[PDB]
Amino acid sequence: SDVFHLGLTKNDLQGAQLAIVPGDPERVEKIAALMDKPVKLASHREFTSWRAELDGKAVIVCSTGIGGPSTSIAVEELAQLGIRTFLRIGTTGAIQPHINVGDVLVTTASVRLDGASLHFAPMEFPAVADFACTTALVEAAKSIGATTHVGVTASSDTFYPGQERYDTYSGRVVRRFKGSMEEWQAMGVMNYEMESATLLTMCASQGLRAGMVAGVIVNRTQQEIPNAETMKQTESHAVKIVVEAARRLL
Amino acid sequence: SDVFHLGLTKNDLQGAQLAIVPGDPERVEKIAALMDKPVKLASHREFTSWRAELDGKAVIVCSTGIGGPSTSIAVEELAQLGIRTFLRIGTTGAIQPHINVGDVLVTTASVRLDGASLHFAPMEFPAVADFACTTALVEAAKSIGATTHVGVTASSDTFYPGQERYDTYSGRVVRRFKGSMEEWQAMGVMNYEMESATLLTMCASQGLRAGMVAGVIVNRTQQEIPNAETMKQTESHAVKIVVEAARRLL
Amino acid sequence: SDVFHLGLTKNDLQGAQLAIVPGDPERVEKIAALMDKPVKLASHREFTSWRAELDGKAVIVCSTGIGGPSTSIAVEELAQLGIRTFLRIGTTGAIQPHINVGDVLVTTASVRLDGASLHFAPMEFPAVADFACTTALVEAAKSIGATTHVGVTASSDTFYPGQERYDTYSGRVVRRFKGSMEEWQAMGVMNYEMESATLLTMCASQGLRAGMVAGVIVNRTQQEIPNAETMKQTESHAVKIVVEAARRLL
Amino acid sequence: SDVFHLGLTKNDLQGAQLAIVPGDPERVEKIAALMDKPVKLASHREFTSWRAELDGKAVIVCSTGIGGPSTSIAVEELAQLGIRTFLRIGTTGAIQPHINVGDVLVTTASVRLDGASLHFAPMEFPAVADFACTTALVEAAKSIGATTHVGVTASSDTFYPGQERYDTYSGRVVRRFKGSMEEWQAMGVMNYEMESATLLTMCASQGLRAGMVAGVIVNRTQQEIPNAETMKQTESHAVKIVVEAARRLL
Amino acid sequence: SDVFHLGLTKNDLQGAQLAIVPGDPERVEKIAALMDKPVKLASHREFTSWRAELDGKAVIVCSTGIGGPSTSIAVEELAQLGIRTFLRIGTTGAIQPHINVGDVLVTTASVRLDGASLHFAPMEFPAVADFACTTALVEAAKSIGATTHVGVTASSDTFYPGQERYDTYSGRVVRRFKGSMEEWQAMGVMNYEMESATLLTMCASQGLRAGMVAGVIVNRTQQEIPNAETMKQTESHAVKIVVEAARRLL
Amino acid sequence: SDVFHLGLTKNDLQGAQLAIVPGDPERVEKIAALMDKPVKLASHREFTSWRAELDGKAVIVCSTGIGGPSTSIAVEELAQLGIRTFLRIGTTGAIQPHINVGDVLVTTASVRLDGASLHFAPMEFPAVADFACTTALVEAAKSIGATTHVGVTASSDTFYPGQERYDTYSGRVVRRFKGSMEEWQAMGVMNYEMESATLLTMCASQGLRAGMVAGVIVNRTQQEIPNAETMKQTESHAVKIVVEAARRLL
Ligand SMILES: O=c1cc[nH]c(=O)[nH]1
Ligand SMILES: O=c1cc[nH]c(=O)[nH]1
Ligand SMILES: O=c1cc[nH]c(=O)[nH]1
Ligand SMILES: O=c1cc[nH]c(=O)[nH]1
Ligand SMILES: O=c1cc[nH]c(=O)[nH]1
């Protein structure tokens, strides 16, 4: 093993330079399935790695887990192995009324409501996505006739208080996040996810290209609930979208 | 007579939805003169405004003066009149060895080294440029075919210390900015300018679309003085890219 | 030229060490007109400089434009040129009930609500004015019988949100400033302006003497925008005392 | 079932109130193995739970995954199901020349080099461990004869930059952390780990009891080359410690 | 003398290594009178020191005056003199409804609402008590017989605004502290005092041991206000515990 | 007796509205000894108070103790009693090479390196002295005759690390203050003291008048700890000036 956590080697990558990176290990194989010669590489803790081919070039699909810390370990060690491009494919809840379930969200930059970001660049620095990656995502989305929304995302270190959830044990929200959802909504923020701020900031400040697409499972402002399924349809659409996007970046 | 500083009315814009905002009041005329039916509207303080037409579409060109404060006033009142799209065209200093004077830099998002951006959104909010605009600006630069670079831009509130300049009256740089240039370089920042952080933030926080393009007049690493035509040929050059970009955003 | 922005040479100042600095370039002439041998020197961007003589000694009048950024430029290059004493003179929105429009406010120190100041000194450093300069302004106002108020001033990097104006396009004010006006008021802050903070800080920390005075054109405890007629000789009181003050500082 | 991520019901916990919380999911069964009637509960994402018994009191063992974000979901949901006391057991790298590999570190409070804890309380708030837990841990540790150290530890949101490691892709570390390790050591901080800050803070500020113990696997000041069975032996001792400590907390 | 403020020489200590540091200089004698052979050493400013014997060992008792600044001097200089362990015995205002007047409160760590702590360690560092000292105080309380509460404490640099008291000259409280007491209560913080943050931080970051205990002379949630009882039984009650605790730290 | 720590009733001030506040309770007397009808009022903690008479006017002399915390208390409570003008007389350490021991220093505004000031105003608020108080102090200095310097002083919450002293127990200074002394020096700061930041901020933001004057007792650019005949005269000097400054503010 060349890296400490991912249990992989330079050779193991077969010369890959691009890595699709979901948060859940269970999703790694499904995605890799959409490409040629999908083989499992390794699996330690929350990082399950898989390799595949796309139009001749080899591509890596590895999980990050939840939060920027785990994410920063995958991105770091993956970069050490030759990875230069990172694409985030996830699921998220919309905080905007007009964004409806089934809509895909490409992120241009993120509100750094995390902590790992700061370990790579001062808060002044923008958690900005790579133009190429972002462009590729929007095009791959447009090509698959999807209802796409491009914009800012709020990347929180917590699933509850940072996303102003009160339905909790304490039932309280720290002063800083009290009333913060109305704020982000007013500023146009599209949704809450938990790893883009760290991914985008660490990459954008290290010469690595990153981008992020994400299917909308739920909506923090609507009342209706996901149809007769939730993840399933959209889930697989955003997945096809990121793979397609990967094609125009190799 | 409506807006307080610009001294303009709804009628003066003539239904204009998009405006080009250079920093220098003298560049306003030159840009409007590149379009159809250029007509001066007003000129107060550092805000001189003109109106023109692109493919039958009324377009505004209003200077902002130097810095985020004056820029925030121009943008606000312009939006009070109906503008929803803003394209900034300015001059800039590159801090990367490969970006020589004369190049065109399109800003995806900016390192917030100002103060006005904080009057619109907390530091954690990304001073990110609207996608459409950025896309239009990149394409336009590729149309006229110019050496172009896309990435982050450090937007300083000062021309000297903020951009780590030691050849000044006092010659000292406050701790926060000492060594900062090598940092921004190490992080791949492309250049220094003085209004993008405020422009991009106030717009992404209020539903306004904004793009940022700039011509390199100096390279903080290289050793040379404005050739002759240098800032002049550069300026008339980027002035074409942005107008050509706006054309795509009308 | 000797400097990059103002387009002046030390010779143009004729040994002048004091400069009266208005924000609006269209007042440089009006103010120089109250002194002897007024001679225009230049006009670049929002930097319009005129030279004159007071008691046989030369004095400079040069605009700074709106906000600390353009101001930091003006002061610096002007200081490189030889000015050691700067007296700002401007318009201002009072936030106290008793302060009437037309009254002159002398600023002892400013509430740093800008960004340029941080480029010269960490926030802990007071945006305090020079004692001699303040004294001269205070006494000049006494020998004129002008309704004078001297105290703390809030220097904002924006004219709208920063000064908590709600009559805007979005109509909202970021958290940092919601309810911020009544807070300053409770603290006895006299007014709102947009350059004293960065001016007083950059001077206080670089061996430069600075003074600040302004004429009240609107009372924020009544309205956000004035309807009041700007220029016969109403707020001229501020100018008269800034000249009379300069006279003493030569 | 009662929570969104863990996939548990209060019934599955059967009255348990104290949970041991390691990072690595594989150590959960191992911890449970040293207790009575242990049984697998559920496994979702990096959240692997097991329930066991001690002195006829039910105990829970749940993994938190790497980092505060992941941990904050486990702790909150564990608390929703009735857990009041949390004991984290983990691996760590000492920064003190006197703290050797294999030694056992008990944490009184952590340096908050994370972001999630802020989502529960402002920085001024101490990421401190409960006194009872800390006592049980120190006590339990003396009983099986380990070489113990009781103090503060640096809880970082990153494994690389935040722990000032330069053997990385970029080879750089933000200004914020350059020379930071030498400053923690100078301050007496014992080690680096990645979850105590969030755990300790969110518990101490919501009426939950929490403590932490760990074993040293690496010394950032030298070369006690990983003697491959070392992590094995060094871990069994802590695990017995955290269990013995838990016994005194039922 | 060997120090600048205390007026003490190493001889004066007679090999002593522990110090009981009350805030009131008049309490110094009262404390020493619970030991053997009390002897007044010196008195300069708010620094009154006495030496006594505790189970045969030399022990120092030195006042620190109110606030972190005075506290920082005493501890630094006492440390220069040879002291290694500090026990803080003070009075406080309980903020939890369940903590009654006369109760004894031991602090594990404090909320840093002071400024001196930052002169020893960044805000992210915890203001935590030494394990041995806190253990000694918990045991002494039990050996003495008292209602004791162990937990976090709010350490404010002021007695009024920083403790959200409103019956003051101004009757107003700065934004930072509005609704802050209600917030700490929600976080389980049990009380307000004015020197633990400094003491705990400066000791934990410099290798010195520190302990914090105080007597509740008032409860901010009840209308009843104790008469002489404040500096009476409650004071004497906490005074006996710290001396008793001290015996275990020799 | 009307206030909580000073042991004074409003009737005790005999209609006094101005108070001189030295940091050392032992000098209160010496100060009163310079006025008419000096009467000892009380002595509680570091708060020793006296009453005197100047030109048929009541004046109070009350020590505040070292630091903003105890200083904020004395001031607050003295204010509740009727005092609206506070003149502080202290001892300081010159940072500039030209300021000699024995020199009198009047403070215009000070660098806020304290914490109490934050309890009255945000950090951008200037710790600025009252104009009338500063004027009289400067005028009184001309009368008494002394080498005077009027400027910015750094008010530190600590005597050693905050003033970057290395003659300490640890011999090291926290990052924030490493090489901080020559930074203030290069910014023209003239001295280090420990109460003005709190005094000036709390008064200026609460509608109270305050001035600052202090006699230099050491020049840091040549030594860390005080010398030879000292305060015997320096103290008498500054006292003579502050007493004369008080005559001017009645
Ligand atoms: O160096 C430079 C050139 C142009 N504009 C800036 O702000 N800086
Ligand atoms: O209200 C006003 C008027 C002038 N300048 C400001 O900054 N505010
Ligand atoms: O050095 C080390 C070892 C384990 N875990 C960490 O966080 N750091
Ligand atoms: O409320 C109170 C009582 C005593 N001491 C404090 O600091 N606060
Ligand atoms: O050096 C010195 C002298 C007096 N007071 C201080 O705060 N520092």
Side-chain angles (χ1 to χ4, degrees):
Chain A
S1 183
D2 288 0
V3 306
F4 191 124
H5 283 104
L6 264 35
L8 297 169
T9 82
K10 186 87 172 188
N11 170 67
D12 259 1
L13 248 63
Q14 287 298 301
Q17 307 195 74
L18 182 154
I20 290 156
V21 293
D24 186 317
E26 296 280 310
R27 301 287 175 291
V28 178
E29 182 177 1
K30 309 179 196 181
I31 301 176
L34 301 182
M35 306 178 276
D36 309 306
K37 294 62 195 172
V39 190
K40 176 159 174 286
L41 288 189
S43 181
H44 308 293
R45 297 212 187 203
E46 50 232 285
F47 317 106
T48 61
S49 27
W50 263 75
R51 193 192 70 237
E53 275 192 3
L54 203 43
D55 294 303
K57 303 84 154 188
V59 165
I60 295 292
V61 182
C62 169
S63 60
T64 58
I66 301 185
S70 64
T71 301
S72 65
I73 280 173
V75 180
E76 174 57 45
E77 316 204 340
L78 260 184
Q80 281 186 43
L81 299 173
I83 302 305
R84 303 279 164 275
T85 299
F86 296 86
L87 300 186
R88 249 285 284 208
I89 191 295
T91 64
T92 181
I95 66 167
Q96 281 302 319
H98 63 288
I99 315 247
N100 304 304
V101 177
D103 290 342
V104 301
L105 307 183
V106 181
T107 301
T108 59
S110 304
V111 181
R112 294 165 59 180
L113 296 177
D114 70 331
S117 285
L118 304 166
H119 289 221
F120 297 90
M123 193 64 85
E124 293 98 46
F125 198 96
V128 68
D130 182 278
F131 181 64
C133 293
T134 306
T135 290
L137 283 171
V138 185
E139 307 253 47
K142 195 236 66 178
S143 83
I144 308 173
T147 313
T148 308
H149 296 295
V150 183
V152 181
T153 291
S155 186
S156 181
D157 253 2
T158 62
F159 178 97
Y160 297 94
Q163 298 183 46
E164 203 175 5
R165 278 187 191 277
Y166 287 90
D167 46 299
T168 55
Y169 169 75
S170 70
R172 83 172 170 72
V173 176
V174 75
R175 185 157 175 167
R176 165 186 176 191
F177 292 101
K178 220 142 55 185
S180 48
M181 204 168 116
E182 205 302 76
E183 266 208 296
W184 306 140
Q185 293 175 298
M187 305 180 157
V189 183
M190 297 180 301
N191 65 307
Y192 281 120
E193 64 80 61
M194 297 170 74
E195 305 71 25
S196 58
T198 295
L199 174 70
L200 272 34
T201 302
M202 84 178 285
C203 289
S205 65
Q206 259 166 164
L208 305 166
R209 306 188 306 173
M212 189 190 103
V213 60
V216 178
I217 51 173
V218 308
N219 185 297
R220 287 289 295 286
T221 57
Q222 306 185 304
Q223 172 116 51
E224 265 178 348
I225 24 66
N227 43 191
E229 44 101 57
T230 307
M231 311 173 348
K232 309 63 190 177
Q233 218 78 330
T234 71
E235 161 88 335
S236 64
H237 265 179
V239 169
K240 174 168 62 176
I241 297 187
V242 74
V243 163
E244 178 49 53
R247 280 166 58 84
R248 327 136 161 282
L249 298 163
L250 301 184
Chain B
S1 55
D2 298 350
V3 297
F4 195 66
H5 299 81
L6 281 54
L8 292 170
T9 65
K10 270 269 185 59
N11 235 294
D12 290 0
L13 278 55
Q14 223 83 126
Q17 302 258 282
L18 172 172
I20 294 177
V21 296
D24 199 316
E26 302 181 10
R27 208 185 305 156
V28 177
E29 138 74 24
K30 303 180 180 170
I31 302 170
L34 225 155
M35 303 176 273
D36 294 349
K37 297 177 202 169
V39 170
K40 185 169 166 208
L41 313 186
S43 189
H44 295 108
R45 289 167 165 290
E46 53 270 38
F47 311 114
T48 85
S49 55
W50 275 67
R51 185 182 78 256
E53 271 200 26
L54 249 183
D55 310 276
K57 287 284 180 55
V59 174
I60 285 301
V61 191
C62 179
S63 59
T64 61
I66 285 170
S70 53
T71 293
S72 68
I73 293 178
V75 175
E76 167 60 15
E77 309 193 333
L78 244 10
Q80 256 170 58
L81 304 168
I83 303 292
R84 302 285 167 262
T85 296
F86 302 70
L87 294 184
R88 165 170 163 61
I89 183 290
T91 56
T92 186
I95 53 85
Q96 296 294 339
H98 58 299
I99 308 180
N100 31 103
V101 307
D103 292 358
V104 165
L105 304 183
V106 176
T107 288
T108 52
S110 299
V111 181
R112 299 171 55 167
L113 291 183
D114 63 320
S117 73
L118 287 162
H119 289 221
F120 299 92
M123 192 61 73
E124 311 95 4
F125 197 96
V128 62
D130 161 277
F131 190 66
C133 299
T134 307
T135 293
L137 288 164
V138 174
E139 287 174 357
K142 175 176 181 172
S143 183
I144 143 73
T147 304
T148 304
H149 299 281
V150 189
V152 320
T153 287
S155 190
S156 183
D157 250 1
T158 56
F159 185 97
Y160 298 82
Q163 306 191 30
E164 227 201 305
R165 283 150 175 288
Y166 293 86
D167 52 350
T168 53
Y169 175 72
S170 75
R172 77 158 174 77
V173 175
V174 68
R175 153 140 37 172
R176 174 189 170 180
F177 292 107
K178 198 164 301 172
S180 61
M181 226 206 100
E182 206 182 81
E183 291 203 69
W184 305 136
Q185 298 179 303
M187 291 178 197
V189 176
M190 296 189 293
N191 55 321
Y192 275 130
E193 70 84 55
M194 302 173 67
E195 300 75 28
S196 53
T198 302
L199 169 64
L200 305 181
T201 305
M202 69 177 307
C203 278
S205 298
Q206 284 173 155
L208 306 175
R209 295 190 307 164
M212 161 72 189
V213 66
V216 169
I217 63 173
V218 68
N219 185 302
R220 298 303 299 283
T221 80
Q222 289 168 43
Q223 322 87 292
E224 196 165 0
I225 318 75
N227 349 117
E229 290 218 304
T230 180
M231 305 165 297
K232 213 167 299 178
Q233 165 57 171
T234 293
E235 192 171 304
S236 66
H237 184 52
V239 162
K240 288 178 177 50
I241 285 67
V242 82
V243 164
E244 183 63 1
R247 205 179 175 199
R248 306 160 194 272
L249 312 169
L250 287 172
Chain C
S1 172
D2 267 345
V3 300
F4 193 89
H5 296 85
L6 318 180
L8 265 26
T9 72
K10 296 185 186 185
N11 176 248
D12 286 305
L13 318 193
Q14 302 268 292
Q17 298 186 72
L18 181 159
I20 300 178
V21 296
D24 181 6
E26 180 190 318
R27 296 299 132 181
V28 175
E29 159 130 46
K30 277 116 172 180
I31 303 164
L34 305 179
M35 303 183 258
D36 299 307
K37 306 158 57 180
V39 178
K40 180 175 174 299
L41 302 189
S43 177
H44 296 303
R45 282 170 179 274
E46 58 263 45
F47 305 119
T48 287
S49 57
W50 267 67
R51 176 183 70 237
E53 286 200 3
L54 211 51
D55 286 312
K57 316 236 69 174
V59 287
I60 299 290
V61 193
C62 179
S63 70
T64 65
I66 290 176
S70 54
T71 299
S72 68
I73 277 170
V75 175
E76 172 63 38
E77 295 181 16
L78 229 42
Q80 273 175 35
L81 284 171
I83 276 53
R84 302 278 161 285
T85 297
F86 298 80
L87 299 177
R88 174 172 137 66
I89 180 288
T91 45
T92 180
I95 57 176
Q96 298 296 340
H98 54 294
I99 298 177
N100 169 225
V101 320
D103 294 355
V104 324
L105 307 183
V106 175
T107 302
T108 61
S110 299
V111 180
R112 295 172 62 174
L113 309 189
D114 65 310
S117 51
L118 297 171
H119 291 215
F120 301 98
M123 195 69 89
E124 300 76 45
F125 193 102
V128 62
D130 175 89
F131 185 71
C133 296
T134 305
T135 302
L137 288 168
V138 183
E139 296 200 309
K142 209 300 295 181
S143 63
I144 289 292
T147 299
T148 307
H149 293 293
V150 4
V152 181
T153 290
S155 176
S156 166
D157 253 2
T158 55
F159 178 97
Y160 293 92
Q163 291 175 44
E164 199 176 359
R165 282 201 163 76
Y166 286 95
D167 258 287
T168 61
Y169 169 76
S170 73
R172 78 169 175 69
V173 169
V174 69
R175 179 190 298 239
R176 182 185 164 186
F177 298 97
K178 283 201 187 68
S180 62
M181 232 244 282
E182 62 230 26
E183 177 140 49
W184 300 137
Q185 196 185 333
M187 295 179 191
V189 176
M190 291 184 307
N191 53 317
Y192 276 129
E193 66 83 54
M194 304 173 70
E195 298 88 13
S196 64
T198 148
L199 166 71
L200 281 14
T201 297
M202 68 177 296
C203 286
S205 65
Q206 297 186 92
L208 297 175
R209 310 190 307 171
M212 164 71 207
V213 64
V216 175
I217 69 179
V218 64
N219 186 305
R220 296 298 307 293
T221 86
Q222 297 168 177
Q223 45 173 46
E224 294 189 358
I225 302 296
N227 357 271
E229 297 335 332
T230 165
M231 56 14 195
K232 309 303 191 297
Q233 38 139 57
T234 289
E235 40 283 302
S236 61
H237 270 304
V239 179
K240 197 289 147 287
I241 83 179
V242 78
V243 174
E244 165 68 324
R247 281 198 58 190
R248 305 144 167 290
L249 292 163
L250 301 175
Chain D
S1 205
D2 274 348
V3 293
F4 298 123
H5 299 97
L6 299 185
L8 298 173
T9 58
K10 305 180 190 177
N11 202 195
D12 298 349
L13 265 64
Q14 17 195 114
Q17 296 183 302
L18 178 158
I20 299 175
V21 294
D24 194 354
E26 291 225 312
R27 182 167 41 183
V28 180
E29 162 169 32
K30 303 181 185 184
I31 294 169
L34 311 185
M35 298 184 292
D36 302 340
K37 313 180 193 299
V39 69
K40 161 65 171 300
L41 249 42
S43 183
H44 302 82
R45 301 303 301 271
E46 55 258 71
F47 305 131
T48 295
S49 57
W50 269 67
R51 190 190 70 260
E53 205 177 73
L54 216 48
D55 299 342
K57 301 274 204 173
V59 171
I60 284 301
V61 183
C62 197
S63 57
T64 66
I66 301 179
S70 195
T71 304
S72 79
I73 284 173
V75 174
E76 164 66 21
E77 288 170 45
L78 248 27
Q80 290 197 53
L81 302 165
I83 296 302
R84 305 292 90 128
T85 297
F86 301 79
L87 299 180
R88 133 155 275 260
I89 189 294
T91 63
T92 192
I95 67 179
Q96 290 302 329
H98 42 112
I99 296 178
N100 322 309
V101 162
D103 292 68
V104 167
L105 280 43
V106 184
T107 299
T108 53
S110 306
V111 188
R112 302 174 59 179
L113 276 29
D114 71 331
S117 59
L118 295 167
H119 290 226
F120 290 89
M123 203 60 95
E124 302 97 5
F125 191 102
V128 64
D130 178 279
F131 187 59
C133 297
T134 304
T135 303
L137 289 168
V138 163
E139 223 83 293
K142 68 161 291 182
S143 294
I144 86 168
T147 295
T148 314
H149 294 296
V150 191
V152 322
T153 94
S155 192
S156 165
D157 257 10
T158 63
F159 176 96
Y160 296 90
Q163 287 182 47
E164 198 175 6
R165 278 190 172 74
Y166 294 85
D167 258 300
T168 56
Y169 171 59
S170 67
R172 84 177 181 68
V173 172
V174 245
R175 179 189 295 220
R176 214 248 275 196
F177 296 105
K178 297 200 232 289
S180 65
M181 187 176 106
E182 179 201 289
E183 200 150 356
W184 301 137
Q185 300 174 172
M187 287 177 187
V189 178
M190 306 188 284
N191 60 309
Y192 279 127
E193 69 82 51
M194 306 171 52
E195 292 80 29
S196 67
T198 291
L199 168 70
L200 262 32
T201 303
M202 71 177 295
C203 278
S205 69
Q206 305 186 89
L208 277 19
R209 297 197 310 178
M212 181 175 106
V213 62
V216 179
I217 65 177
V218 61
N219 192 287
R220 296 291 301 295
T221 118
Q222 70 210 60
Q223 295 190 358
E224 179 51 315
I225 314 294
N227 305 311
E229 175 256 4
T230 353
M231 166 281 266
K232 168 178 169 296
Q233 50 174 216
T234 304
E235 160 165 276
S236 309
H237 292 64
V239 168
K240 192 158 193 175
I241 287 177
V242 63
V243 174
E244 173 57 354
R247 192 181 293 289
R248 305 162 145 72
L249 291 170
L250 278 35
Chain E
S1 76
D2 310 339
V3 283
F4 183 69
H5 297 82
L6 274 34
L8 305 161
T9 185
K10 295 198 179 192
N11 198 211
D12 286 312
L13 278 49
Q14 287 298 285
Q17 299 197 70
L18 180 143
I20 297 184
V21 297
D24 181 344
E26 302 169 58
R27 192 184 304 157
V28 180
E29 183 180 6
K30 292 175 176 48
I31 296 169
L34 296 208
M35 297 183 286
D36 298 302
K37 315 309 172 57
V39 64
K40 182 172 189 181
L41 295 172
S43 181
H44 307 308
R45 287 170 180 272
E46 54 266 46
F47 311 124
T48 289
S49 55
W50 274 63
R51 177 174 46 79
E53 286 174 53
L54 189 51
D55 291 347
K57 311 307 295 294
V59 169
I60 296 285
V61 180
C62 183
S63 46
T64 72
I66 297 166
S70 297
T71 298
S72 95
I73 292 175
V75 180
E76 163 58 35
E77 300 191 14
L78 287 170
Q80 277 181 43
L81 291 165
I83 302 298
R84 300 295 88 120
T85 307
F86 308 87
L87 291 183
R88 217 299 249 204
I89 179 283
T91 60
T92 170
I95 68 177
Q96 291 302 341
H98 73 294
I99 307 179
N100 303 142
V101 164
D103 286 3
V104 177
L105 309 185
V106 173
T107 303
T108 62
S110 305
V111 182
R112 301 166 62 184
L113 297 177
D114 66 325
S117 52
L118 291 153
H119 293 204
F120 293 98
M123 200 61 101
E124 38 266 353
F125 190 104
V128 66
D130 160 85
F131 184 69
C133 290
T134 311
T135 301
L137 291 163
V138 166
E139 280 174 16
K142 170 168 169 291
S143 140
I144 294 307
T147 306
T148 306
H149 297 276
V150 177
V152 181
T153 293
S155 191
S156 166
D157 246 356
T158 67
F159 179 99
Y160 301 86
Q163 295 189 38
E164 205 180 356
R165 273 188 163 95
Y166 286 90
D167 215 63
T168 61
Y169 166 84
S170 80
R172 74 166 188 92
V173 182
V174 66
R175 191 198 216 81
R176 220 279 267 301
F177 298 109
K178 275 208 310 176
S180 65
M181 174 167 88
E182 177 178 6
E183 184 148 26
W184 305 133
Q185 301 182 312
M187 285 171 205
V189 174
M190 34 185 227
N191 61 311
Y192 280 121
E193 62 79 54
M194 303 174 62
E195 33 270 319
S196 70
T198 297
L199 168 68
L200 266 29
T201 296
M202 84 181 295
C203 280
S205 65
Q206 299 193 84
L208 286 345
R209 293 192 308 180
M212 177 58 209
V213 65
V216 176
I217 60 173
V218 73
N219 186 301
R220 299 286 302 290
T221 65
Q222 324 187 72
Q223 52 251 64
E224 34 134 294
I225 313 303
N227 51 314
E229 304 310 53
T230 293
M231 2 74 80
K232 199 71 174 183
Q233 287 180 53
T234 299
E235 185 169 352
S236 302
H237 199 174
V239 162
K240 285 179 297 179
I241 296 169
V242 78
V243 168
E244 180 53 46
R247 311 180 62 196
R248 307 144 185 282
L249 303 171
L250 300 180
Chain F
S1 209
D2 253 339
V3 289
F4 195 77
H5 316 63
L6 307 187
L8 295 161
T9 63
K10 175 180 160 294
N11 178 61
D12 271 343
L13 316 194
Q14 287 297 293
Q17 296 183 65
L18 175 162
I20 301 170
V21 298
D24 178 11
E26 244 188 306
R27 310 324 178 196
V28 180
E29 197 177 318
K30 293 91 149 306
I31 298 174
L34 294 195
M35 300 175 270
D36 309 316
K37 301 180 185 60
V39 174
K40 178 175 181 288
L41 284 172
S43 170
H44 294 285
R45 284 163 168 285
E46 53 275 35
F47 306 118
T48 292
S49 58
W50 277 65
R51 193 218 307 137
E53 187 170 296
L54 258 182
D55 307 312
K57 301 302 304 181
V59 287
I60 289 299
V61 187
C62 179
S63 55
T64 68
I66 297 175
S70 49
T71 291
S72 63
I73 281 174
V75 171
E76 168 54 47
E77 294 186 355
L78 279 170
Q80 278 170 38
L81 294 172
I83 301 298
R84 277 57 199 270
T85 307
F86 308 76
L87 291 181
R88 164 172 154 62
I89 174 65
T91 54
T92 186
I95 281 183
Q96 295 297 334
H98 69 79
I99 300 170
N100 313 308
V101 168
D103 276 32
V104 176
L105 306 182
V106 174
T107 304
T108 57
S110 47
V111 187
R112 299 173 56 184
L113 304 178
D114 63 330
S117 59
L118 283 321
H119 291 213
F120 300 92
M123 189 58 88
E124 27 284 85
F125 185 95
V128 61
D130 167 76
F131 189 71
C133 300
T134 309
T135 298
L137 288 167
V138 171
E139 290 304 307
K142 301 184 187 173
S143 291
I144 306 306
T147 72
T148 312
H149 298 281
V150 191
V152 176
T153 91
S155 186
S156 166
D157 252 11
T158 61
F159 177 97
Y160 302 88
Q163 294 184 39
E164 194 169 2
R165 278 188 156 94
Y166 294 91
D167 288 349
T168 60
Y169 171 72
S170 53
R172 81 145 213 291
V173 171
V174 75
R175 182 194 288 223
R176 213 246 279 197
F177 296 112
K178 280 184 179 64
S180 70
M181 179 168 93
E182 37 201 354
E183 264 160 31
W184 301 140
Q185 190 188 316
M187 293 179 204
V189 178
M190 34 182 221
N191 63 311
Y192 268 131
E193 68 92 38
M194 308 175 60
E195 289 80 28
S196 70
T198 306
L199 176 63
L200 270 37
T201 303
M202 80 179 286
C203 289
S205 62
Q206 284 190 130
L208 297 164
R209 307 196 307 166
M212 235 310 264
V213 58
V216 179
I217 63 168
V218 66
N219 186 296
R220 297 298 303 282
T221 78
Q222 44 181 62
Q223 57 165 139
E224 267 188 55
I225 194 274
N227 220 262
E229 171 152 64
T230 33
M231 299 75 144
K232 187 176 295 68
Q233 309 303 297
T234 308
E235 181 186 64
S236 265
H237 212 191
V239 171
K240 279 173 186 173
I241 296 178
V242 67
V243 179
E244 172 66 23
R247 283 170 54 77
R248 295 161 169 278
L249 296 145
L250 297 184

